[PDB]
Write an enzyme that holds these catalytic residues in place. Structure first.
Site, PDB file in Angstrom:
ATOM      1  N   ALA A 177     -17.707  -0.851   2.592  1.00  0.00           N
ATOM      2  CA  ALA A 177     -16.567  -0.832   1.673  1.00  0.00           C
ATOM      3  C   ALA A 177     -15.274  -0.328   2.295  1.00  0.00           C
ATOM      4  O   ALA A 177     -14.224  -0.525   1.729  1.00  0.00           O
ATOM      5  CB  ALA A 177     -16.882   0.086   0.502  1.00  0.00           C
TER       6      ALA A 177
ATOM      7  N   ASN B 209     -11.769   0.429   4.048  1.00  0.00           N
ATOM      8  CA  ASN B 209     -10.683  -0.380   4.391  1.00  0.00           C
ATOM      9  C   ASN B 209     -10.456  -0.098   5.855  1.00  0.00           C
ATOM     10  O   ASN B 209     -10.670   0.983   6.357  1.00  0.00           O
ATOM     11  CB  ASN B 209      -9.390   0.107   3.706  1.00  0.00           C
ATOM     12  CG  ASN B 209      -9.202  -0.391   2.316  1.00  0.00           C
ATOM     13  OD1 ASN B 209      -9.582  -1.520   1.997  1.00  0.00           O
ATOM     14  ND2 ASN B 209      -8.518   0.418   1.506  1.00  0.00           N
TER      15      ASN B 209
ATOM     16  N   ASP C  48     -23.057  11.873   4.607  1.00  0.00           N
ATOM     17  CA  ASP C  48     -21.918  12.264   3.818  1.00  0.00           C
ATOM     18  C   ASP C  48     -21.571  13.693   4.199  1.00  0.00           C
ATOM     19  O   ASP C  48     -22.455  14.482   4.593  1.00  0.00           O
ATOM     20  CB  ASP C  48     -22.164  12.083   2.304  1.00  0.00           C
ATOM     21  CG  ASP C  48     -20.895  11.977   1.518  1.00  0.00           C
ATOM     22  OD1 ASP C  48     -20.593  11.005   0.878  1.00  0.00           O
ATOM     23  OD2 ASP C  48     -20.129  13.028   1.589  1.00  0.00           O
TER      24      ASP C  48
ATOM     25  N   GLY D 266     -19.789   8.076  -1.758  1.00  0.00           N
ATOM     26  CA  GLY D 266     -18.833   8.288  -2.813  1.00  0.00           C
ATOM     27  C   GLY D 266     -19.066   7.306  -3.954  1.00  0.00           C
ATOM     28  O   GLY D 266     -20.141   6.750  -4.148  1.00  0.00           O
TER      29      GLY D 266
ATOM     30  N   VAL E 185     -18.182   4.286  -4.336  1.00  0.00           N
ATOM     31  CA  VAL E 185     -18.679   2.989  -3.907  1.00  0.00           C
ATOM     32  C   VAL E 185     -20.017   3.095  -3.124  1.00  0.00           C
ATOM     33  O   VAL E 185     -20.995   2.386  -3.424  1.00  0.00           O
ATOM     34  CB  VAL E 185     -17.620   2.305  -3.028  1.00  0.00           C
ATOM     35  CG1 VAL E 185     -18.185   0.914  -2.604  1.00  0.00           C
ATOM     36  CG2 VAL E 185     -16.326   2.159  -3.866  1.00  0.00           C
TER      37      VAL E 185
ATOM     38  N   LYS F 185       0.853  -1.178   0.000  1.00  0.00           N
ATOM     39  CA  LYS F 185       0.000   0.000   0.000  1.00  0.00           C
ATOM     40  C   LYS F 185       0.897   1.238   0.000  1.00  0.00           C
ATOM     41  O   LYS F 185       1.987   1.239   0.575  1.00  0.00           O
ATOM     42  CB  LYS F 185      -0.921   0.128   1.235  1.00  0.00           C
ATOM     43  CG  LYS F 185      -2.147   1.020   1.009  1.00  0.00           C
ATOM     44  CD  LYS F 185      -3.245   0.196   0.358  1.00  0.00           C
ATOM     45  CE  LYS F 185      -4.622   0.906   0.284  1.00  0.00           C
ATOM     46  NZ  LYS F 185      -5.753  -0.058   0.205  1.00  0.00           N
TER      47      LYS F 185
ATOM     48  N   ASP G 170      -6.841   4.778  -5.016  1.00  0.00           N
ATOM     49  CA  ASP G 170      -7.361   4.658  -3.696  1.00  0.00           C
ATOM     50  C   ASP G 170      -7.846   6.021  -3.279  1.00  0.00           C
ATOM     51  O   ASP G 170      -8.225   6.802  -4.155  1.00  0.00           O
ATOM     52  CB  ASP G 170      -6.487   3.899  -2.655  1.00  0.00           C
ATOM     53  CG  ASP G 170      -7.264   3.487  -1.388  1.00  0.00           C
ATOM     54  OD1 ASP G 170      -8.274   2.777  -1.402  1.00  0.00           O
ATOM     55  OD2 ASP G 170      -6.780   4.001  -0.271  1.00  0.00           O
TER      56      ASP G 170
HETATM   57  N1  LIG Z   1     -13.369   2.337  -4.722  1.00  0.00           N
HETATM   58  C1  LIG Z   1     -12.934   1.044  -4.605  1.00  0.00           C
HETATM   59  O1  LIG Z   1     -12.826   0.318  -5.570  1.00  0.00           O
HETATM   60  C2  LIG Z   1     -12.624   0.669  -3.109  1.00  0.00           C
HETATM   61  C3  LIG Z   1     -12.125  -0.667  -3.036  1.00  0.00           C
HETATM   62  C4  LIG Z   1     -11.809  -1.079  -1.714  1.00  0.00           C
HETATM   63  C5  LIG Z   1     -11.895  -0.361  -0.573  1.00  0.00           C
HETATM   64  N2  LIG Z   1     -12.404   0.903  -0.787  1.00  0.00           N
HETATM   65  C6  LIG Z   1     -12.661   1.816   0.346  1.00  0.00           C
HETATM   66  O2  LIG Z   1     -14.018   2.219   0.384  1.00  0.00           O
HETATM   67  C7  LIG Z   1     -14.104   3.574   0.940  1.00  0.00           C
HETATM   68  C8  LIG Z   1     -14.875   4.438  -0.050  1.00  0.00           C
HETATM   69  O3  LIG Z   1     -14.172   4.478  -1.325  1.00  0.00           O
HETATM   70  P1  LIG Z   1     -14.735   5.382  -2.575  1.00  0.00           P
HETATM   71  O4  LIG Z   1     -13.956   4.927  -3.755  1.00  0.00           O
HETATM   72  O5  LIG Z   1     -16.227   5.468  -2.779  1.00  0.00           O
HETATM   73  O6  LIG Z   1     -14.274   6.854  -2.068  1.00  0.00           O
HETATM   74  P2  LIG Z   1     -14.873   8.223  -2.505  1.00  0.00           P
HETATM   75  O7  LIG Z   1     -13.904   9.310  -2.227  1.00  0.00           O
HETATM   76  O8  LIG Z   1     -15.353   8.116  -3.924  1.00  0.00           O
HETATM   77  O9  LIG Z   1     -16.103   8.456  -1.513  1.00  0.00           O
HETATM   78  C9  LIG Z   1     -15.876   8.687  -0.122  1.00  0.00           C
HETATM   79  C10 LIG Z   1     -17.151   9.363   0.212  1.00  0.00           C
HETATM   80  O10 LIG Z   1     -17.305   9.521   1.646  1.00  0.00           O
HETATM   81  C11 LIG Z   1     -17.585  10.830   1.931  1.00  0.00           C
HETATM   82  N3  LIG Z   1     -17.071  11.148   3.254  1.00  0.00           N
HETATM   83  C12 LIG Z   1     -15.786  11.512   3.610  1.00  0.00           C
HETATM   84  N4  LIG Z   1     -15.605  11.623   4.948  1.00  0.00           N
HETATM   85  C13 LIG Z   1     -16.868  11.330   5.453  1.00  0.00           C
HETATM   86  C14 LIG Z   1     -17.315  11.258   6.767  1.00  0.00           C
HETATM   87  N5  LIG Z   1     -16.518  11.527   7.796  1.00  0.00           N
HETATM   88  N6  LIG Z   1     -18.628  10.935   6.915  1.00  0.00           N
HETATM   89  C15 LIG Z   1     -19.386  10.688   5.824  1.00  0.00           C
HETATM   90  N7  LIG Z   1     -19.041  10.739   4.572  1.00  0.00           N
HETATM   91  C16 LIG Z   1     -17.784  11.087   4.440  1.00  0.00           C
HETATM   92  C17 LIG Z   1     -16.807  11.549   0.825  1.00  0.00           C
HETATM   93  O11 LIG Z   1     -17.309  12.883   0.696  1.00  0.00           O
HETATM   94  C18 LIG Z   1     -17.193  10.742  -0.398  1.00  0.00           C
HETATM   95  O12 LIG Z   1     -18.534  10.958  -0.848  1.00  0.00           O
HETATM   96  C19 LIG Z   1     -12.656   4.022   1.253  1.00  0.00           C
HETATM   97  O13 LIG Z   1     -12.267   3.747   2.603  1.00  0.00           O
HETATM   98  C20 LIG Z   1     -11.869   3.116   0.290  1.00  0.00           C
HETATM   99  O14 LIG Z   1     -10.525   2.987   0.801  1.00  0.00           O
HETATM  100  C21 LIG Z   1     -12.755   1.379  -1.986  1.00  0.00           C
HETATM  101  O1  LIG Z   2      -7.833  -2.941  -2.388  1.00  0.00           O
HETATM  102  C1  LIG Z   2      -8.000  -2.095  -3.334  1.00  0.00           C
HETATM  103  O2  LIG Z   2      -9.054  -2.157  -4.028  1.00  0.00           O
HETATM  104  C2  LIG Z   2      -7.021  -0.948  -3.597  1.00  0.00           C
HETATM  105  O3  LIG Z   2      -5.826  -0.967  -2.736  1.00  0.00           O
HETATM  106  C3  LIG Z   2      -6.696  -0.886  -5.101  1.00  0.00           C
HETATM  107  C4  LIG Z   2      -5.771  -1.986  -5.604  1.00  0.00           C
HETATM  108  C5  LIG Z   2      -6.141  -3.345  -5.641  1.00  0.00           C
HETATM  109  C6  LIG Z   2      -5.313  -4.299  -6.239  1.00  0.00           C
HETATM  110  C7  LIG Z   2      -4.078  -3.889  -6.750  1.00  0.00           C
HETATM  111  C8  LIG Z   2      -3.688  -2.549  -6.713  1.00  0.00           C
HETATM  112  C9  LIG Z   2      -4.546  -1.600  -6.159  1.00  0.00           C
HETATM  113  K   LIG Z   3     -10.253   6.595  -5.986  1.00  0.00           K
END
Ligand SMILES: NC(=O)c1ccc[n+]([C@@H]2O[C@H](COP(=O)([O-])OP(=O)(O)OC[C@H]3O[C@@H](n4cnc5c(N)ncnc54)[C@H](O)[C@@H]3O)[C@@H](O)[C@H]2O)c1
Ligand SMILES: O=C(O)[C@@H](O)Cc1ccccc1
Ligand SMILES: [K+]
Ligand SMILES: NC(=O)c1ccc[n+]([C@@H]2O[C@H](COP(=O)([O-])OP(=O)(O)OC[C@H]3O[C@@H](n4cnc5c(N)ncnc54)[C@H](O)[C@@H]3O)[C@@H](O)[C@H]2O)c1
Ligand SMILES: O=C(O)[C@@H](O)Cc1ccccc1
Ligand SMILES: [K+]
Ligand SMILES: [K+]
Ligand SMILES: [K+]
Ligand code: NA
Lengths: 347, 348
Positions: free
Chosen positions: B260, B262, B205, B184, B186, B78, B118
């Site tokens: 979703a 992490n 949000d 967001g 996800v 990471k 990320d």
């Molecule tokens: N996107 C992926 O493919 C993915 C995969 C694995 C893990 N994750 C994890 O899922 C989470 C969301 O990812 P994402 O891609 O939608 O991010 P994103 O930035 O698109 O959305 C995050 C959302 O949460 C809102 N937010 C921020 N702080 C907040 C709070 N304190 N209270 C409420 N809302 C708040 C943000 O304004 C935004 O709308 C993260 O922790 C990310 O690490 C995402």
């Molecule tokens: O767990 C996840 O979704 C992110 O760390 C994106 C990622 C996945 C796999 C490989 C590289 C990057």
């Molecule tokens: K992103």
């Protein structure tokens, strides 16, 4: 310091902790501008991790300058293994595991970093690293490397010393008193070369036997507590770095500083004091470069022992160029050498 | 302290400091046992560099287990870029330089680490990194990458959620109350999937426009200050990690935790408390694995979109396995997931 540990401006810091042995590993790649970073592996105890990170970055930066000023096609890097106990107290199995881990770290860098021997590491250790990673200089002749670079380092420091003594107006080493601090592989050879040139040698070493033997050889010992207060013509630091603090700079009673130690000068203020006091200092990264000339010259450029010796002898001419810039631009030798490094590097 | 953050047991830590931009860079490779380490690049502000290192380490260890449990032949790593200021306040030139330097760091690892998007990093940034280094997943489709993995992550979390409510004895989502924290990329997709499945959605949000949009869609807003106190059937953290501390775990009023984010669980005690309280938690590293399945599956394994979809749906099945170990062995689901990761790793 926190700044030298954390806000270091080098290209990359690699760290790892191995709970089993208790060792911390640091590799600092200062610059890869002129080629892969290269620099030795120092193994020692540090009171704090910040100290190991600090040392690694300063040593790595000195290596970049050394390669630049020495016309070697490599970048600068350094490894520091912060041991859980004194090297000598580490058991064989522990040491072996430490080297294995260090080799894995180097390997991940895939050629961006080439290691070599340094404090507490030897050619046998290089061979062991080489059982796991290709990026190692200084393997034994038996294993394909150039072996020991100590003598070449001593020749270069000796040539540096001669050039410095001449530039300082003292003529030659004949009839001068030279204080060698550290009777290791390099220091002892340097003492021998200087004595043959006619100098009277004052020697110091933390190892009693090493001192007793030099004395047996006709040299005169200096007690550790007296090293930095003993009058001499030339002070030849061949033990640890950081010897010349501001206070030491103010009180050293010599006319020339030319030794093998890395990072001799503890602060910029020290360098200006030496300069102001009329003590001519031969920049460490220029003076001790014979080691790098030996390993990079032989292993990377294919040079023979004789050419490497010649190039180490040419460290006297590089220093004459450094002193010329220093005299012309009115800057300290260290600044002038950095300037020369940059010019040679076509920066 | 840097000191304690340095006492990490992972394979390697790479750091860099860029004076010019004032950014700090961390890449933590937890493990390269199953393959090169892989994990996204998170950019955010940190109080101290130690926190960035700590975060990187925890996130890297979760990636190790995520790949293992999801049957992806990669290790876990990471990156964390500690910003000198808030993401939106960073000028484009600064940003551009930050990414260039990050790419140079990745490049030196020569394939031992592959990144992806990320928090605060996107496909465009992936393209930019790719101008300097090859080891990047998530490039735009045009640049040869698999694009956005958000929807795949959402599908995986939604399936996780369905499997979890079921195992918990609540039936189908139809009619259950689901609180989505973070709307967001996800979270927004998860909220739609859940809504379509018949759930009643409560949402929160920091972005008021997103909440307004959800509300226009019939969901109900929850003030940020009330998120951790809102009764619901399912709590779905889809914003920041570390939300469930020991204290929150004792008072959370829900039956299931499936989101979703992490690193959802801030402390191990929190994990034990949810388990003891009967709140069934779907481990983050299992539940949100859809993004990894999408990136690695598409870019490394050569899987079709359809297969990726299927693998993500299979996260529910993975969870059923996890719950089965947890029940049989009497361990938390997090521990059961780690056991399962190890088993799969070996079989593989
Ligand atoms: N996107 C992926 O493919 C993915 C995969 C694995 C893990 N994750 C994890 O899922 C989470 C969301 O990812 P994402 O891609 O939608 O991010 P994103 O930035 O698109 O959305 C995050 C959302 O949460 C809102 N937010 C921020 N702080 C907040 C709070 N304190 N209270 C409420 N809302 C708040 C943000 O304004 C935004 O709308 C993260 O922790 C990310 O690490 C995402
Ligand atoms: O767990 C996840 O979704 C992110 O760390 C994106 C990622 C996945 C796999 C490989 C590289 C990057
Ligand atoms: K992103
Ligand atoms: N060997 C090379 O090729 C080489 C090349 C470049 C730079 N250097 C530098 O030269 C210095 C010495 O190198 P070496 O290979 O001979 O090391 P070495 O370990 O073989 O010898 C160092 C000697 O100094 C003695 N010593 C330690 N601390 C002392 C102190 N405070 N006062 C007096 N003696 C002390 C030790 O007991 C030992 O005899 C180091 O700083 C090293 O980084 C060495
Ligand atoms: O400067 C030196 O002499 C040591 O850092 C050994 C070394 C030199 C060159 C390359 C690798 C290692
Ligand atoms: K480690
Ligand atoms: K040595
Ligand atoms: K003389
Ligand atoms: Na971005």
């Amino acid at each position: 310091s926190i700044d030298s540990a954390l806000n270091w401006d080098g290209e990359m810091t690699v760290t790892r902790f191995d709970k089993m042995t208790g060792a911390h590993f640091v590799i600092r790649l200062d610059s890869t501008q002129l080629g892969p970073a290269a620099g030795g592996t120092r193994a020692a105890q540090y009171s704090q991790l910040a100290d190991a990170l600090t040392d690694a970055g300063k040593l790595a930066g000195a290596m970049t300058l050394k390669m630049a000023v020495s016309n070697l096609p490599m970048g600068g890097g350094k490894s520091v293994i912060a041991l859980p106990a004194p090297r000598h107290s580490i058991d064989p199995s522990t040491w072996a595991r430490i080297l294995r881990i260090h080799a894995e770290n180097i390997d991940k860098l895939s050629g961006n970093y080439w290691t070599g021997p340094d404090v507490n590491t030897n050619s046998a250790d290089m061979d062991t690293l080489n059982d796991t990673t290709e990026f190692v200089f200084g393997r034994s002749l038996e294993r394909g490397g150039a072996g020991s670079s100590a003598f070449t380092t001593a020749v270069g420091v000796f040539e540096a010393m001669k050039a410095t003594v001449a530039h300082r107006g003292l003529g030659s080493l004949d009839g001068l008193t030279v204080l060698v601090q550290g009777l290791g592989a390099v220091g002892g050879s340097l003492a021998s070369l200087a004595a043959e040139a006619g100098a009277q040698l004052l020697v110091a070493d933390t190892d009693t036997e090493r001192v007793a033997h030099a004395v047996a050889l006709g040299h005169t010992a200096v007690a550790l507590e007296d090293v930095l207060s003993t009058p001499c013509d030339v002070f030849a630091p061949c033990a640890m770095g950081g010897v010349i603090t501001t206070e030491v700079a103010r009180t050293l009673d010599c006319s020339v500083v030319a030794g093998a130690a890395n990072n001799v000068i503890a602060d910029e203020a020290a360098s200006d004091i030496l300069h102001a006091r009329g003590i001519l200092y031969a920049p460490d990264f220029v003076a001790n470069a014979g080691g790098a000339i030996h390993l990079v010259g032989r292993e990377v450029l294919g040079w023979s022992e004789s050419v490497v010796h010649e190039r180490a002898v040419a460290i006297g001419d590089t220093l004459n160029q450094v002193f010329e810039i220093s005299d012309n631009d009115g800057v300290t030798p260290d600044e002038a050498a950095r300037t020369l490094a940059g010019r040679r590097a076509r920066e």
